[PDB]
Amino acid sequence: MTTDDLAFDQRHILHPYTSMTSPLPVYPVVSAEGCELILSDGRRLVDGMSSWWAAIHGYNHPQLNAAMKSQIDAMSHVMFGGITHAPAIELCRKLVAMTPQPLECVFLADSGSVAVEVAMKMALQYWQAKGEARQRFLTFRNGYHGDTFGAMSVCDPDNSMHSLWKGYLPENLFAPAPQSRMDGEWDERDMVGFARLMAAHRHEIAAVIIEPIVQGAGGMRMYHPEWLKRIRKICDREGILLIADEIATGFGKTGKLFACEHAEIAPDILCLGKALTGGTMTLSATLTTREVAETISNGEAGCFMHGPTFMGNPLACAAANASLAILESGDWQQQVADIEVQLREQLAPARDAEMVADVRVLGAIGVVETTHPVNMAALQKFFVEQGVWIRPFGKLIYLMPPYIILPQQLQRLTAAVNRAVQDETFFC
Amino acid sequence: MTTDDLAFDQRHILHPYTSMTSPLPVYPVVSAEGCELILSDGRRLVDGMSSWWAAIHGYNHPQLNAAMKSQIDAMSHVMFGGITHAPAIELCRKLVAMTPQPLECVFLADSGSVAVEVAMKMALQYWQAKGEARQRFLTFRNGYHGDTFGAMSVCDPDNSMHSLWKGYLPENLFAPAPQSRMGEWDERDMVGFARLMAAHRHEIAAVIIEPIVQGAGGMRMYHPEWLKRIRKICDREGILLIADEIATGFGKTGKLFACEHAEIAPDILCLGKALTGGTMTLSATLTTREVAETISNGEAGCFMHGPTFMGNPLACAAANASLAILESGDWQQQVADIEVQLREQLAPARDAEMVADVRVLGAIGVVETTHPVNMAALQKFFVEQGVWIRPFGKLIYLMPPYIILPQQLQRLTAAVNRAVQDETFFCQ
């Protein structure tokens, strides 16, 4: 990669949520292996982000590589319309078996936002088929479910700047963000807001949608499992569908295979992505119950009205399959368990740093919330200089490393966070 | 694949737009090579669909294969937030170079519907930043733009069963489907469109259409004069023009991009399907400096979107290799020769009783029937003829790989003519 290459990227290439007139620096990666990213100039970085929570087995994993190459030898892609294939079947087999019992119907798709759109469409078509006028969604503040129109309609209105689309997006119901902590105690006062909304709109609510236990992009919040129990039961009593968006929490990240396990509940609709493929390429899945799948198919439309061009992509399914196989060994439990203890122990000190507001850890997720917003360009440069890859945002410096990280590598990550928050150099 | 594998697929795996209470047969594919699919029983099928218009160079292409495997050796994925890489740089250079001059800013995404979602979001953010109350989209009837909620809102209300979502979907403006055929131009065709423009010009955020070919909404082929007039009306009113080329892009209609047929440039361009040579999902939305800059200078400070697998290196490497094959220029004469053979060999369908119309454009051949096809019976018939053809509603259509051998194309056109001779394969 030359500097002419980099100039082209700056001038012509949009990146996620970032200015085109005032872009900040981006770092050129040429390769990756184990828990390391390798920059154009040869510098090696310990990855603390797992490429946004997806690369749970790291990079250039032998088993993922072998699976992907063997699938390329067979066929990289074939359409799913009237056709099925081994990688899709094996993948759906594992997904059904590894999730609660009632979730036995799988809709594969290409990205997490699309998986959410699917869930929402499933809920609307379900009620339409039942003859009930239910088109509203009840969600939590601080939630994040994707960037498409429907997914945006259930994202935190303030976080996502809904004023930009005021009049275009449908207006849903927003209960207050859950206050009780995953670490701490339950407080029944937490429920009043949600109960008042349910009492007033019970008759028009299509589904309740939330991220179980951990609210990711909306604040790295970690709330009490009692919430899911309460919600599940309310939805049960009222007949309302429950959608669990586990695109970020799925596949071992919070200490359990699926965060719903922390509450011992099952949603009617389950959304999966990110770590599904071991972070090799995009893929998503939405699982539901027989009751939902059949009810939809029996309505006016005769089917679930959705079907993306690359639905069931073999290459991505094979990668996903190999990822799940690594997990079946059960090794991830001990790895995550150990990462959780090392994160609690090594981020604890940051609680005393002046720029820190809170420190929370769950599974392989370690968060340092600061009092002021970070200086993006300066802090990013700092992490790179320390030989680590950490990508902060707003007031959140967080780590979510591959499960195969070595204690020495993890220690390099925690050391870097602790050093970043020791004064105001990199803030505002 | 065992029989138990197939049974599992039937009862637990959703497929595109098809019933889970009355599921129809699917055919198990083990691999693919050249222009053929290979079933579990050893049967080889000539692919007439290109996996829904994407696999323009066929299957197991050695160059596509080597490019994917090589990138896997370097890294199949790394996040795009704060990072860039060769495969994305190289792809954006080609996309910018091969499209019209004003289209020079690229937003890569994972699927086509998202590309459209991105285009619609660009138009809304653009007007918001300019302080103008513009939230309507003006489009054509019979249009198809994707399955996610925003895309759905510009799809044909009747074809897409909008009654199902009445009250959730924003209400856009729908001008009459273009009548003039790809045929003589009739000025009266414009009355509709003009009426809508006059009553809502102050409110229209953008005009969105599929240029020349309306695919999924009816495989319709209309006069290029329409694009000329729409470009002129949009210039005059100062409205943005979105051209959805997810289906027409990369050679399909005999020109690299269908907007060429009118020598017009849109403000926003959507690409997908054949972008990667049909190996895996990837999409792209290009726009102008005016749009990208205006948006980044508005209140949000950026364009508000960023999928997790944005810029996926493996997908980008695949697309680069696919674009490199097209660079040779061989596709032009390949598509021209396919157009001739389609015209010549579909002509006979005009003597068949079940046919309503026959139309061909570039590598696309369409036989529209008088009655809806019997999906299960017609699909099995084609498989028995050693071809893969996937019809729908009243359309039996062909979009084969550019490298298809004349004897392979003959097998496809022969099967179509046979299917439409009588009622056997019709209704259900």
Ligand code: NA
């Ligand atoms: Na299950």
Ligand code: NA
């Ligand atoms: Na261009």
